[PDB]
């Protein structure tokens, strides 16, 4: 939206300390060639998105500390994404980045989307059971959509008749916290 050029990294790429130093480190204060050849005033600047930051393993060679150091002198916007903020591996990011929490979305905020999907896909969904589906997925919207896609292949009507079986079958067994 803000007219930036995205340089994205994830767990599918090597992000060790050596690769980080020889990789995105040079991109902190470097112009984007694509931005120059695609000429907004911010199109020439990078937005470094480090996704799945918790997916890198290693006390020092992993590069978590190196990323934390990078966060203190980056000359371009840097956005990190992780699933577990309180893990010990994330300690270096204590007070160096602006923390933004994404909470589990409530049923109401997504009832309209679920109804739109249900009618567009031409299968009937009861709005009174949607919350239950959310309870099955623990607020995982992707999981809810996958459940609808998989169930609708054979059962074209979703209501209280089969809500219990569907919820029990797709229950997300997440390990509890201490």
């Amino acid at each position: 939206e803000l007219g930036y050029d995205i340089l994205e990294q994830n767990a599918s790429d090597v992000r060790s300390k050596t690769l980080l130093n020889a990789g995105v480190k040079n991109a902190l204060d470097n112009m984007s060639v694509v931005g120059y050849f695609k000429h907004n005033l911010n199109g020439k600047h990078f937005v470094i998105i480090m996704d799945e930051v918790d997916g890198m393993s290693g006390g020092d060679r992993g590069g978590v500390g190196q990323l934390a150091q990078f966060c203190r002198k980056t000359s371009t916007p840097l956005i990190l994404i992780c699933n577990e903020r309180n893990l010990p591996k994330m300690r270096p990011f204590d007070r160096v980045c602006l923390d933004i929490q994404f909470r589990r979305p409530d049923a109401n905020s997504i009832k309209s989307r679920l109804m739109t999907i249900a009618i567009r896909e031409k299968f009937k969904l009861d709005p009174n059971v949607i919350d239950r589906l959310i309870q099955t997925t623990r607020g995982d919207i992707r999981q809810v959509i996958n459940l609808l896609s998989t169930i609708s292949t054979t059962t074209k009507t979703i209501n209280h008749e089969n809500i219990n079986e569907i919820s029990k079958a797709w229950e997300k067994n997440i390990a509890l916290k201490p």
Binding site: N10, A11, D51, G55, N83, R142, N146, T154, A169
Partner: protein, 318 residues
Amino acid sequence: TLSLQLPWVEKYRPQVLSDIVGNKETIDRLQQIAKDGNMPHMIISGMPGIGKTTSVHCLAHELLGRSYADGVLELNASDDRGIDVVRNQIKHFAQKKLHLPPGKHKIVILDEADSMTAGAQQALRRTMELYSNSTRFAFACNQSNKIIEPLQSRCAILRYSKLSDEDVLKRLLQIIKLEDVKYTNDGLEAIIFTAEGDMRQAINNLQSTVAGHGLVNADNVFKIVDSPHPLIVKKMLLASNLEDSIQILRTDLWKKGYSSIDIVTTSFRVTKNLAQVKESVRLEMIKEIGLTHMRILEGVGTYLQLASMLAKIHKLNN
């Protein structure tokens, strides 16, 4: 003799979804997916020997047909599946250009996915997300909890249930008809009882009994298939009198060659799963069994220690 007879588990391995017994709703869903395509990322979980690998392979075959060789990448615990493999070979397969019909996709079958490391699973996330337009992933495992939550979120969950005795009997009858095996109802009942819902175990036991004795009846079946020792342990723990429990321990377990460590571990498991007994009593029995297990692990694995454990259990029960 240097010749081998093909095992019946392989010879009569189902080749189509319609030949798989049990879990009817899931099989029908897979059949519908094969007819219509658009197979999603899926995770199939369940107990050993119920037809998970068979189901995945049959689905892939029905989906791809002649293209199966090019469009299927199969990896299991016997192959290299490290983070480097995920980052290079799987990525290359996902990015590969392959012209397919207008409702089919390339398939990556990660069998025994519960053995994969956390790093490889994490690396698989964006690979699945970015290349879903042409590639789909099918995990097969025994414990779905070993699969990290992000991967579960990306896949459709299919939990396979245990096979009922009816389905095992049905498949065994088909195999017997196809093999012309002389049998008796009692022998088939014994085979089903010993299998405990394991189709592979049932078929292997049937083949071994036929090879070793010919006629499939209770005597031959039990000669080939020993009575499971967990049931003997349960009978020992449920005995009313200490003398009966000691008799069972000495005759059915100790004189048959079962090790003390095996006996104590089986006792712990059976006591854990003893619903007929009050939970507090079960906890006391577990305390005593754990004392005995520690003593055995230290090195004193004698019949006297097991007898003392039984005496303490009976004293608790009284």
